């Protein structure tokens, strides 16, 4: 009765009664084939946007292959010439002014095209992040086929809840449909558990596939899956070299995405910014 | 003995013959260092594109740090002045026209540059999605080191196929090379199994690490891993409080990426679109 707790005293629940359970779950293993109509994504039906977006190249083919994972008389002469010179100048200014309006309208269409390609790239990245989570989910379904359907699992709370009996799997659209049979604990005994016990302060023991439960102020052993206290023997314990606990701290890992450097906009632009103030010539 | 099936009747295969297996497996745990030459990715060797891409800033440094995870005299005087005025006008129109051609060429280069930066961003998101899938594969290799190489797994069909014996691991380029030894079932007995049995409708039982197999029209027990029917005793069953099945359904989850609804292009563009029409002055 000189057994002493090793590792502390913890109140935990040990099953005392069970019922047969049937859990039915779907696990996704694939996705529909997804491609992007980049012209329809960015422009819709607007023909000016699509016409300007043609000049952006075949990036949709590249995106979609990523998604699918494959003295007086002379004055009259001067008046005649001035009419032609001013006719050619006025005509030239119109051609200049028409090309300036075209450039400004195309620049504004480019900005909305470019902004909607940033939204497009965010969606392609989201599609790629979902298809990665589907691949993670497809691996979880294959682990349950191997360990729940093609065999019986000793893992508790893996093929549903409780202790595995038998599993069935059926094809379902974009995944697999599992039917699990278990006996699940419906009632628990809140028991006083020590991780190990020290004998006489010299020799420590650990419960072999079970718990050390203090019942009626004496330390007894019970199986972990069912509350049935029983005397501590050599068949249900493991001998520890010492009854001192070896404490360990696993590394602390938190995913924190780092913000990019991205220098000041004006300072970076000033390396090449040609801000000119063009001045028209003075013509008499 | 009035033992009724609980949960239905299912035909499943229980091993009856095994052979020793050797499975050799590669699991990738890392990738080679990948960076992007964005000037070469977008422009290739085209120097007119690489000159214009310099003005796009240091986005490659940002992208690559993400990838690596760190009243006759007067008339002659007028003719002299008119020759200079038309000389200055013609010179100015030429400078304007040269800057109009430059602006149109640069705009067309910016459209192919922007389209190829959208294909660049798709590749970066694909490379970041393979980066997470390799990390997922690196965690699966560390689970096999901990549970197959540094210990013996009680999980069937985990360290290869069948029942684990011993595993070995070697370093392979960008991964770990596993060698699994196990006894895999080569022949099966198709047995009629009930997940549990009910006795007189009062108390149900569940098989403890095994199967309830109906053989010769009497309900028997067998271990799950090997087909050896035996009488149902209290050592190989778990008593259920009731023989009614507790049916549950896990929530249905399908990854269906939401489409990023964008406004009508023309309606959004019309908030700021300046579709001016410029008319040259009338000059007689």
């Amino acid at each position, epitope marked *: 009765d000189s057994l002493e707790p090793v590792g502390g005293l913890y109140e935990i629940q040990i099953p005392s009664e069970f019922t047969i359970g049937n859990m039915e779950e779907f696990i996704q293993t694939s996705s529909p*084939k997804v*491609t*992007i*109509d980049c012209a329809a*994504f960015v422009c819709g*039906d607007y023909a000016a946007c699509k016409l300007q977006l043609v000049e952006y190249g075949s990036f949709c*083919d590249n995106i979609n*292959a990523i998604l699918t994972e*494959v003295n007086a008389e002379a004055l009259n002469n001067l008046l005649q010439q001035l009419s032609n010179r001013f006719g050619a100048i006025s005509a030239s200014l119109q051609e200049i002014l028409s090309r300036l309006d075209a450039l400004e309208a195309e620049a504004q269409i480019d900005r909305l095209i470019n902004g909607r390609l940033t939204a497009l790239n965010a969606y392609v990245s989201q599609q790629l992040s979902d298809s990665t989570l589907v691949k993670f989910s497809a691996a979880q379904a294959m682990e349950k086929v191997n360990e729940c359907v093609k065999s019986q699992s000793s893992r508790i709370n893996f093929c549903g809840n409780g202790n595995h009996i038998i599993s069935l799997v059926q094809n379902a659209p974009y995944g697999l449909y599992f039917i699990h049979f278990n006996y699940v604990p419906t009632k628990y005994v809140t028991a006083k558990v020590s991780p190990g016990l020290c004998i006489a302060g010299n020799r420590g023991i650990a419960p072999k596939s079970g718990y050390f439960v203090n019942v009626n102020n004496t330390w007894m052993y019970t199986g972990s899956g069912y509350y049935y206290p029983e005397p501590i023997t050599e068949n249900n314990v493991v001998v520890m070299s010492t009854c001192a606990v070896n404490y360990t701290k696993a590394p602390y890992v938190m995913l924190n995405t780092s913000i990019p450097n991205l220098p000041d906009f004006k300072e970076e632009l000033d390396q090449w910014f040609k801000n000119q103030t063009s001045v028209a010539p003075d013509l008499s | 003995d009035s033992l009724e099936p609980v949960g239905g009747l299912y035909e499943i295969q229980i091993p009856s013959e095994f052979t020793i297996g050797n499975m050799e497996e590669f699991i990738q745990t890392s990738s080679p260092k990948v960076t992007i030459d964005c000037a070469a990715f977008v422009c290739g060797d085209y120097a007119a594109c690489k000159l214009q891409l310099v003005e796009y800033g240091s986005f490659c440094d940002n992208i690559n740090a993400i990838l690596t995870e760190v009243n006759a005299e007067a008339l002659n005087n007028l003719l002299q002045q008119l020759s200079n005025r038309f000389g200055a006008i013609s010179a100015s129109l030429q400078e304007i026209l040269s800057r109009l051609d430059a602006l149109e060429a640069e705009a067309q280069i910016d459209r192919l540059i922007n389209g190829r930066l959208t294909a660049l961003n798709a590749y970066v998101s694909q490379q970041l999605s393979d980066s997470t899938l390799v990390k997922f594969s690196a965690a699966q290799a560390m689970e096999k080191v901990n549970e197959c190489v540094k210990s013996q797994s009680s999980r069937i069909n985990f360290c290869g196929n069948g029942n684990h014996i011993i595993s070995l691991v070697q370093n392979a380029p960008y991964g770990l090379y596993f060698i699994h030894f196990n006894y895999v079932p080569t022949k099966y007995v198709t047995a009629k199994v009930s997940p549990g049995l009910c006795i007189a409708g009062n108390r149900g039982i569940a098989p403890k690490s095994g199967y309830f197999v109906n053989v010769n029209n009497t309900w028997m027990y067998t271990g799950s891993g090997y087909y050896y029917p035996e009488p149902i005793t209290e050592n190989n069953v778990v008593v259920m409080s009731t023989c009614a099945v507790n049916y549950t359904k896990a929530p249905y989850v399908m990854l269906n990426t939401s489409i990023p609804n964008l406004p009508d292009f023309k309606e959004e563009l019309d908030q700021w679109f300046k579709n001016q029409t410029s008319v040259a002055p009338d000059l007689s």
Partner: antibody
Amino acid sequence: EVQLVESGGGLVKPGGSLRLSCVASGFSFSIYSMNWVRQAPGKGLEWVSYISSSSSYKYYADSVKGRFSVSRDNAKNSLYLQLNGLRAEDTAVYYCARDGYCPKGVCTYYGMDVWGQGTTVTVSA
Amino acid sequence: EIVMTQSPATLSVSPGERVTLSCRASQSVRSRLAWFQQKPGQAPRLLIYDASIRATGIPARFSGSGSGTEFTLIISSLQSEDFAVYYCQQYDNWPPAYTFGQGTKLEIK
């Protein structure tokens, strides 16, 4: 209900031209991708052309590349195929079918569920 | 070019008999495989898509399975109206380059 109707088929001398039309009805044609598939006399199905809902991405089988042109008019819910430079091998029954859903430029694929009844192109001398 | 091969091109079957139609792709098309049925003088009818998903209204007796380069269409309880020509079609990669199998004819027996 939801159906596709082909027209514009008939006898055509070799090297001639035909204009097949596939007017859609019953579904949102403006967002679906469409295909042309031809069936030669007593032979399997051959995919001719694919056109996207925005008409920007058109694809052709190599056997018809250059000589065949696909077009659509989502306002008229109709699909067209220009059969230029018709040869002997182009004698077939030409089908149109839906391919991709594409509700907002994002296409999902569920098979060519809807087909047209076809039209017959006979190219002989 | 992914070539789709169906063998045998002909099958003699009787009503109530299980029929398996095999399809093979020269390259892995993953799960982008569809099954079509073409009764004489009629357009093809989509039966299975994604190699295993029945199209709407398709009877439960038509079952699809497989992935990669081996695909199968199962007609569990063949009926008198199932005597038709059956094709497989692949739509795996981008751009669209769709190739059908040469068909399999179910002859009455």
